[PDB]
């Protein structure tokens, strides 16, 4: 933990606003705009109460009896609250789809930020790492849960400069009950997880490392660019996956980045999870120590590069 006092402050100011609603229903919300396609998330206005939320829509046609099991596992999420975890407002069932209304983080995802900026500088990426490391420690130490799906599209930002995790794995029944999962073109799953073997939070550590390389260089880094392509800066899914399992992991270029940054990601992307750094080892890495003591006005950088 090592909770600061101000972190208590900003959490508590949200949790007073928490009680500002009691019940949720479809007609409370008005669609403001479409964010992206994956589930799909919409900006919505809540009308019973002035809170503005993010509503993500997951389409499911399944029988009533299973739903009460999902919801009771899902009720635990009202208990977890952290400056590193997106605040949650409630869950309900309506017209063949669960709507999840959550805290709106005005900076969007790291994917859409990277696209606009071109590249993310080393010093910003240091501040992001600290927030992620402390979130995973909290989940391990207090609730014994791994995230299982860490990636840039599920890392949200705001203009105050807070960083919060979403879309983590709270419900064992929901995983099993979800018969049909959907794959796309980028995969952030660790090698051990891809081979269907025993896994732990270590697979999440790989996902963080790989996510950082993408954002640092501005391109999904598998396959690596060639020599002449890195100066300037149509593949099937199984070829990509087989690259992750058998080829050496991506690495940062050795010219333009510090050894602490290069060594940190390298320690995150060791394929053998027993040698991959764990949270205890990560907390003490030189790269993290430097970033933690650095004074960077992250809000100002975000507003100025995205044009407010």
């Amino acid at each position: 933990l090592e909770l600061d006092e101000q972190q208590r402050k900003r959490l508590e100011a949200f949790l007073t606003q928490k009680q500002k609603v009691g019940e949720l229903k479809d007609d409370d919300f008005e669609k403001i705009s479409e964010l992206g396609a994956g589930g799909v998330v919409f900006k919505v206005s809540h009308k019973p109460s002035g809170l503005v939320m993010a509503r993500k829509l997951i389409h499911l046609e399944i029988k009533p009896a299973i739903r009460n099991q999902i919801i009771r596992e899902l009720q635990v999420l009202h208990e977890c609250n952290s400056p590193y975890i997106v605040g949650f407002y409630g869950a309900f069932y309506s017209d063949g789809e669960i709507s999840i209304c959550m805290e709106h983080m005005d900076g969007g995802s790291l994917d859409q930020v990277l696209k606009k900026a071109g590249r993310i500088p080393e010093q910003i990426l240091g501040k992001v790492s600290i927030a992620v490391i402390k979130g995973l420690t909290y989940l391990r130490e207090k609730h014994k849960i791994m995230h299982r799906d860490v990636k840039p599209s599920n890392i949200l930002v705001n203009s105050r400069g807070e960083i919060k995790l979403c879309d983590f794995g709270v419900s064992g029944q929901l995983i099993d009950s979800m018969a049909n999962s959907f794959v796309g073109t980028r995969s952030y799953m660790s090698p051990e997880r891809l081979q269907g073997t025993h896994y732990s939070v270590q697979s999440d550590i790989w996902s963080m490392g790989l996510s950082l390389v993408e954002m640092a260089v501005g391109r999904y880094p598998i396959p690596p660019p060639d020599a002449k392509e890195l100066e300037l800066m149509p593949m099937a899914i199984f070829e990509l996956l087989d690259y992750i399992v058998n080829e050496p992991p991506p690495k940062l270029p050795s010219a333009v980045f510090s050894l602490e940054f290069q060594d940190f990601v390298n320690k995150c992307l060791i394929k053998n999870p027993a040698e991959r750094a764990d949270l205890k080892q990560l907390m003490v890495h030189a790269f993290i120590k430097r970033s933690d003591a650095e004074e960077v006005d992250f809000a100002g950088w975000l507003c100025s590069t995205i044009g407010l």
């Binding site: 396609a37 994956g38 995983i175 099993d176 018969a179 049909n180 999962s181 959907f182 794959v183 796309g184 073109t185 995969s187 799953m189 997880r193 891809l194 081979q195 269907g196 593949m235 099937a236 899914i237 199984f238 070829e239 996956l241 087989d242 399992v245």
Partner: protein, 275 residues
Amino acid sequence: SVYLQEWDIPFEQVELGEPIGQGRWGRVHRGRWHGEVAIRLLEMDGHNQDHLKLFKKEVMNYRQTRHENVVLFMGACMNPPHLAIITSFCKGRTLHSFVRDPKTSLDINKTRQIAQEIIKGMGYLHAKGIVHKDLKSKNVFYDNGKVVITDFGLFGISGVVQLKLSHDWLCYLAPEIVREMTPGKDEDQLPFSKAADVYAFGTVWYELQARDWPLKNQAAEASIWQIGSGEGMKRVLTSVSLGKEVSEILSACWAFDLQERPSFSLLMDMLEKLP
């Protein structure tokens, strides 16, 4: 355009009843031909882009078929863009829900006879040059002894409907297909073959033994590599022994090199020389 008056079966009337499930290949309704039928309703965006030409070909191909272990293909009417495929209605339970019922008692004899029936049906289809794309335990019906195969050759059609995959389906997909899988690519492009069908029969054979599918539910990506590498099926083959004769045909059907997979006529003999 093909109509109901061109068909073997004399047509007078057909009343829709309750639907009984939706999928990426339209909606299936309990119907009434004086006999109940299954009616699959489709829409074809292929505005006469050889889709109908192929559809007329494939549907006529389904015609001239009859076998005690395969569904009776009855009719296919097309009032474009709205199409419909009328099949005989199988009473009883799917093999999926049947094998997973606790009260069911299957043995090496019941299991053998069931597999034989499936091969006899699948043999007919291969003899007619009809590749049964999409063979799985959800598309096989059991009714106090009678065994029927369903929804054959449906993937050859190019009608309207990130990758979209189920878990129950992946366990039947052979490696050659999974490697070729890529976004924006349609089902018609995948390399289904007579060999691709016998692989899916292996996952059926495994379900007949293990009363479940080979890969405990995972992220589809995991199932991709495990299947596309062939290592996954190698592990589950080693992970539990069943019997040299039983494991013989499971290692046979799931052979990584498709040419190392037996024909269905060969599988008839393998099922004879068994307990």
